[PDB]
Symmetry: D2
């Protein structure tokens, strides 16, 4: 069993992106006999596609968990749906602001995550980690990668499990926001890394249950 976890580089003027640290901390670890691979994706349309595709082909994971930063979000949120569209509110790190354009022409308008979102949310709660199910991952790069991942699964038969997880700003990222108006929510990095690691565990456990029953 191989698990692929991805995070993103900094964007929107942000100095850092917590998901990038998460990808690095989990890269190369092992949960039982399962090997986890952590890779960081660029916040650039097209380029991120090429990288995601190349990484998936390379590793051929059984489970793919894509993590992204959700500014303003107060808790961990597991994405339920991926949409076949791009309507970036802001441009990507290359200055590309794509509006009302499909991700994969002719492909399904949307894909449901294949991760045990309910079970993942349940395990997080037992761990005292606030978490809820989100019904929209936006239409920027996070939804982009989540849709592509799920499309790959439906077209290539792998990864069997794929989904997306959004994490709040981490505390240190709010320091600057303070001297600029209001103050958005945050969650300590340690809790965010544990949440993602817990999603991996629940997925792996659910897989063993499927390949047996």
């Amino acid at each position: 069993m191989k698990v692929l976890v991805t995070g993103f580089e900094p964007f929107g003027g942000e100095k850092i992106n917590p998901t990038e640290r998460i990808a690095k901390d989990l890269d190369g670890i092992k949960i039982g006999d399962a090997q986890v691979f952590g890779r960081v994706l660029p916040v650039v349309f097209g380029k991120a596609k090429e990288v995601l595709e190349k990484t998936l082909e390379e590793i051929k994971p059984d489970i793919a968990i894509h993590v992204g930063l959700a500014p303003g979000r107060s808790a961990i949120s597991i994405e339920r749906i991926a949409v076949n569209a791009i309507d970036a509110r802001i441009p990507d790190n290359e200055g590309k602001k794509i509006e009302d354009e499909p991700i994969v022409p002719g492909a399904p308008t949307a894909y449901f995550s294949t991760l045990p979102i309910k079970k993942i949310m349940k395990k997080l709660h037992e761990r005292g980690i606030p978490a809820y199910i989100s019904n929209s991952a936006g239409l920027y790069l996070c939804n982009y990668v989540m849709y592509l991942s799920l499309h790959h699964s439906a077209t290539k038969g792998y990864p069997k499990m794929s989904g997306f997880i959004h994490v709040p700003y981490i505390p240190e990222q709010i320091i600057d926001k303070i001297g600029k108006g209001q103050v958005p929510p945050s969650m300590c990095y340690e809790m965010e890394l544990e949440a993602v690691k817990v999603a991996i565990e629940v997925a792996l456990t659910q897989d063993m249950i499927n390949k047996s029953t």
Copy 2:
């Protein structure tokens, strides 16, 4: 030097109150040659005043930092003002819903905190802890306590430094909320505990400076 740190017991159906854990964790601690005293207060008007007075009388702290829970707050908040009034929406842990009633008749309409709130907030940011100055501590028990402490300071000459700090919900407190509205913001306990400790450290440093000029 003696420092009094207070916290509160659970209130409003809440299973816990992080300020209670904070008070107990800092009790009996020493910061340099200073002795910290941690005390838990009841969420009952009158009874809280009774305990506050006796505690201040018994210890005669040089510095008094009162901590409380502020549901919905997304960062640490240091109170700048205590108002001489009691107008609560929800009744205390007794059933008495006191509305429109002075805390101490004839006493000043408001008192300014005597803690170095600016220096405190500065250190918090350097430590990566999101904080800001609040210009209203409410008009419930938290403001009640902050007002009485400052009033005691002006009538008895001690403590020379008195203030109030509000802390966001703790992660595990958010679990019991997912079907209601948008998940409330939280801050991990460890960061809240450190935040209060830093306030004590900064207040201690400010005091050693007062005796120099």
Copy 3:
């Protein structure tokens, strides 16, 4: 040209539903050369589908605009996508709380609204009415109706244009909210009524350009 506009009855404890008045005020009042029908739907699973199917079959509208109440929303929001799922956070008006279930088994995971959402938003802005594109209509009855309507359109070829609009609370609804908890956003009825009429106008305009090529 026939235009069908729907609203919902009261739910979630509220005494009224602004979308119900909107449907009633618009009913019968022609807009240009098109007839407008305003119908109210029940906030009940199953029953609302029957009522919806019957209304569409009866009228056979060229354009259907469904309106719903979105508590907590601060501006007009135009739904972009309908998802084939039901996961009520609260039960319907008959105590039914369906979880993790499709609306139409084997039907597309999701449908894109066929209304001129971007032009509707631009026009509303010119009229001084705050509006934005929402990427999730929730998974309660509003999404339920949105999906069924878009599915009908794909299955029967009509209505040619179908979409959903969410309106904030109206002022009078916030009154009893002020007491407990916080104060949710609202928008005066007159503006919400105007916004929906505007949407119809913009829809009618886009319809001509389509048939005129």
Copy 4:
């Protein structure tokens, strides 16, 4: 009976200020035998104090209701207390930012509004207008005038009744805020105008405290 109602000019970044319109629309009207005066204050420290002083001296109002814009607020708010301090987070219209500075040295730390705040909030509710009592009007220009007005009353004897009311953004102001991030709350100008007028009506009704056998 002479009533004074003031509003402010556009602060900074806003092309308009609803209170400026309210002041102008209410100027000259009469409520029974009471005459209402509407004056607009500059958003500059010092200059605002000067203008406020001349205006009060000239008119010698029996009731003073100052109105200001509170971005983000979702309902009408009635200020309960004015604090003797200035802590600007943004430079004024002129170009001077003040941090921790008394408005009137030696003057009381705070002044309670002398308007029938409770009576006012109740009447607004009856009229279907969401409103609540605020316990902090900030420490910028709005608090500045509120304090000066209440100080003038206590030292010069007039106005007998003085207070402050904050109003949310009006719809048209949100339009440009939509292309930035989370859409802030708003309230139609018509309701804000009526809210202020209602505050006056209640203020005058309460002034009947001159009834005898």
